[PDB]
């Protein structure tokens, strides 16, 4: 059963030899038969033989993407194989892959175009990928605009990453253009907006944000994010904007900002005499006035 296979092929039993090699599991015999068939047959006929048998096509497909030791492809083989089998998603992925190796955006979009062009040969079911392809071509274009205007790197970043870089660099007008264009979700966009301003240290517009009523992600994120590596002063300003909170945590939040005074004040406001004690003993009836803590009851 190990060279009982060439026996089958010596009598030019092509498709039958392949099947016995597949049953064997011996991947070596399968390559050997695949190699024989390729040298012997019209390529189109080879594809028909090899597409009837899942394991065979799979191995054919592997060798095509690894024929010097990683990297290099037999992209030509892949395209034709997928074309003669009407495997359009697999064919499109070959072109997408080609777009990721193109050094200029115009060429990269051309590959995406080739990629898309295959998918409109069956339209339905491929709606998402068509939309996705259409988006990247737009994003690449907008990013090439940004690079020339604003003189910084943008091409290749994700939608979200682009918003981030635009905001960190103070270009909120453009960053809002990306958002509106690609219909970025509210909660997503607010999370991005916050993280960028914090990276940017733009404490001024973080402040200007705080001047509206509600947040789709709450103000809890604004507290922690600003506190961490930032202004306890600015941080503290987000209590009591915080709707979604647990009992007596506004207190600990003032504490975490280093404001024992206002914590004590918040402690008294909540009718929690115990926390007020803990806060006064922390100072100590005399230190840090403490009297001021004491005067607050």
């Amino acid at each position: 059963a190990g060279r009982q296979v060439p026996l089958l092929l010596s009598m030019e039993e092509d498709e039958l030899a392949l099947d016995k090699a597949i049953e064997s599991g011996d991947t070596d015999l399968i390559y050997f038969v695949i190699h024989q068939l390729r040298r012997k047959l019209p390529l189109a006929s080879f594809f028909r033989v090899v597409s009837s048998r899942p394991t065979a096509s799979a191995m054919v497909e592997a060798l095509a993407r690894n024929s010097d030791g990683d990297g290099n492809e037999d992209t030509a083989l892949l395209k034709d194989l997928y074309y003669q089998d009407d495997r359009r998603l697999d064919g499109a992925s070959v072109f997408i892959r080609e777009a990721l190796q193109q050094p200029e955006t115009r060429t990269a979009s051309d590959k995406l175009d080739l990629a898309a062009n295959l998918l409109q040969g069956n339209q339905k079911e491929h709606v998402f990928e068509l939309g996705a392809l259409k988006e990247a071509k737009m994003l690449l274009r907008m990013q090439e605009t940004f690079e020339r205007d604003l003189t910084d790197s943008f091409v290749g970043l994700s939608v979200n990453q682009t918003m981030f870089k635009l905001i960190k660099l103070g270009y909120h007008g453009r960053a809002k253009k990306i958002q509106s264009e690609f219909k970025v979700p509210e909660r997503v966009a607010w999370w991005i907006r916050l993280q960028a301003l914090v990276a940017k240290r733009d404490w001024n517009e973080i402040e200007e944000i705080s001047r509206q009523r509600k947040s789709p992600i709450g103000w809890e994120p604004f507290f922690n994010q600003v506190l961490q590596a930032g202004n306890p002063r600015l941080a503290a300003t987000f209590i009591p904007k915080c709707t979604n909170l647990e009992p007596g945590q506004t207190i600990t939040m003032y504490e975490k900002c280093g404001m024992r005074v206002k914590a004590a004040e918040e402690a008294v406001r909540l009718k929690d005499t115990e926390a007020w004690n803990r806060l006064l003993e922390a100072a100590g009836r005399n230190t840090a006035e403490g009297r001021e803590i004491e005067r607050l009851g």
Partner: protein, 601 residues
């Protein structure tokens, strides 16, 4: 007389050294980088130079030294990516040489027709001395054998390459030739069945050889040493590796990355050895991280209280005793200092908001909560730029545990990933679709198994809704300090894979928590897991405690290794359990099989 993992290491070392003796003179070494690690488990670098090796080079590095006349190639012989690389290595110094060179290639484990053609169609087949180096299992522990194929998951489940299955089959057959036929081959899943098939084919080819004058001396009869081999296909249970592992070794693999019993930390950075030769690590590795503090404390104050031991003493001889126990009091000292440092780092890691937001999702998904209820939490994680592998594992978790994703939620998820991390990940999401780890609910391939909706679909998926109850996957009342059940490895969630194994080995215990072999008693229940259930008896044709081989086709996690060691302690009386695997797998390795890394920049 029984199976000993030492015979595999000693044989491996023998067969390599024997080939090194064969190359008369001194050598330069060109080793496949993925194979360098696993080699380290069977021979020392020191030992390799005794046998005449100058410098070490990687096949992937192309910078093979010119200093020596004999250049030695060591790489896996099934790899096509290696053959093309070796031939191109020969002429890349055949034209820029100094002498002429005699080239040597040790194929692991065998010389293939593919090798002999790629080497011939490069003109260099006749200029190279080719021999076979039959390494299969790398004994990583006395109870853990591994083929160490790092792309075995990708190759098997994405590329549909049946090479992992073939190597795994020959390895197990090697155990049979030496110790007897597996009295029972017990399994679950397509690739588990394929291995059982090749074992059946290979058993018949050995009887066909002997009958037809190929001799081979002695026909194979059922083992007296071996009870059974149990084979589980990884694709039967994708949920376990997708989950964040919660054992000590498990968290090391998740955060630092374990490979060939070794990892990297920052005191470029330094290497830690992680095997069971260390006394302390043996008691730590399989323990839930929660009680690792306890375990470190207790051993720390048991060290200083055994330094309180007998240095009072003084005759002249009972101090010569105490002083010889002092190397080990330094080994045990520093063993503790290293792991007290790792634990400290891993603790900080497990305190972050993002870590806790991920675990929270997993815990809800794994408990049977409406997957939809986790959507906002996933949305945030994406927007907070948490590493793509960590998000994808959640996405696949949701898909695999629910019978796929609702169509609305799918498209939202697709948009987040693509917009979060890049449009390149069209390819990534496609690959996870091929892996059948991330699918729409309306796909035929998404459906879980029911006895209700009988027909329609042949590759119906594992029912986590059914098996959660029927195999008691949830034990949220489990002591981590003195664990009563395998669910401890996830702090309340027992891996389905090991539960499946428990259907064979611990039938009574399994009934207890809700004496025949095979699946008897759990036929219905196991029918609800993906793929073929089988129990092939080998009678051939012509007592004490026995060894059980529990085999994972497609990779095994440390948590699963842990849960198996747990069972092995329980069964210490009648059974010695040995674990076999194609490789040691985890959630991140799985996603890397899928993640496209090209980038549009």
């Amino acid at each position: 007389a029984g199976f000993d993992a030492e015979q595999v290491r000693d044989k491996a070392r023998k067969d390599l050294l024997h080939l090194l003796e064969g190359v008369r003179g001194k050598k330069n070494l060109v080793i496949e980088k993925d194979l360098a690690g696993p080699l380290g488990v069977i021979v020392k670098a020191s030992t390799l130079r005794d046998y005449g090796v100058d410098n070490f080079f990687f096949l992937e590095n192309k910078n093979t030294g010119t200093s020596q006349r004999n250049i030695v190639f060591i790489a896996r012989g099934e790899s096509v990516r290696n053959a093309h690389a070796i031939a191109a290595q020969i002429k890349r110094i055949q034209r820029e040489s100094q002498t002429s060179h005699d080239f040597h290639i040790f194929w692991v484990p065998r010389r293939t027709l593919f090798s002999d053609k790629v080497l011939e169609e490069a003109g260099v087949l006749g200029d190279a001395n080719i021999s076979e180096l039959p390494l299969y299992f790398f004994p990583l522990e006395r109870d853990v054998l591994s083929l160490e194929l790092n792309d075995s998951f990708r190759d098997l489940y994405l590329a549909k390459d049946p090479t992992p299955v073939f190597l795994l089959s020959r390895a197990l057959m090697g155990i049979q030739k030496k110790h007897g036929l597996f009295p029972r081959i017990i399994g679950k899943g397509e690739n588990a069945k394929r291995v059982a098939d090749l074992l059946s084919r290979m058993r018949q080819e050995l009887l066909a050889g002997e009958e037809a004058g190929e001799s081979d001396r002695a026909g194979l009869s059922p083992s007296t040493t071996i009870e059974s081999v149990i084979i589980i296909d990884r694709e039967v249970d994708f949920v376990t590796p997708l989950l964040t592992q919660l054992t000590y070794e498990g968290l090391i693999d998740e955060y630092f990355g374990i490979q060939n019993n070794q990892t990297d930390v920052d005191a470029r950075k330094r290497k830690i050895q992680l095997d069971g030769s260390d006394s302390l690590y043996s008691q730590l590795r399989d323990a839930n991280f929660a009680i690792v503090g306890s375990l470190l404390n207790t051993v720390a104050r048991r060290l200083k209280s055994d330094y309180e031991s007998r240095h009072n003493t003084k005759t002249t001889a009972e101090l010569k005793e105490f002083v010889k126990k002092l190397p080990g009091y330094q080994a045990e000292q520093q063993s503790l200092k290293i792991h007290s440092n790792i634990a400290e780092e891993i603790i900080n890691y497990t305190r972050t908001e993002i870590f806790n937001k991920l675990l929270e999702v997993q815990q809800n998904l794994a408990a049977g909560a409406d997957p939809s209820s986790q959507f906002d939490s996933i949305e945030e994680l994406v927007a907070r730029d948490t590493p793509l592998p960590q998000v994808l594992r959640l996405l696949c978790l949701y898909s695999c545990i629910s019978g796929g994703i609702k169509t609305k939620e799918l498209d939202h998820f697709r948009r987040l990933v693509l917009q979060g991390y890049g449009h390149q990940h069209l390819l990534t999401l496609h690959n996870l679709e091929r892996l059948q780890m991330f699918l729409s609910k309306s796909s035929p391939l998404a459906s879980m198994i029911t006895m209700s909706g009988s027909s329609g679909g042949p590759d119906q998926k594992t029912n986590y809704t059914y098996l959660r109850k029927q195999l008691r996957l949830i034990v949220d009342e489990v002591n981590e300090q003195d664990p009563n059940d395998i669910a401890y490895v996830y702090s309340g969630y027992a891996p389905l894979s090991i539960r499946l194994v428990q259907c064979v080995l611990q039938k009574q215990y399994l009934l207890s928590i809700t004496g025949a072999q095979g699946w008897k008693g759990f036929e219905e229940i196991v029918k609800h897991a993906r793929g073929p259930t089988f129990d092939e008896i080998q009678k051939g044709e012509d007592g004490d405690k026995k060894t059980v081989f529990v085999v994972f086709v497609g990779g095994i996690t440390f948590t699963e290794i842990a849960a198996l060691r747990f069972i092995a302690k329980q069964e210490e009386a009648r059974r010695n359990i040995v674990i076999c695997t194609t490789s040691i797998i985890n959630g991140n390795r799985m996603m890397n099989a899928a993640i496209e890394t090209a980038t549009f920049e």
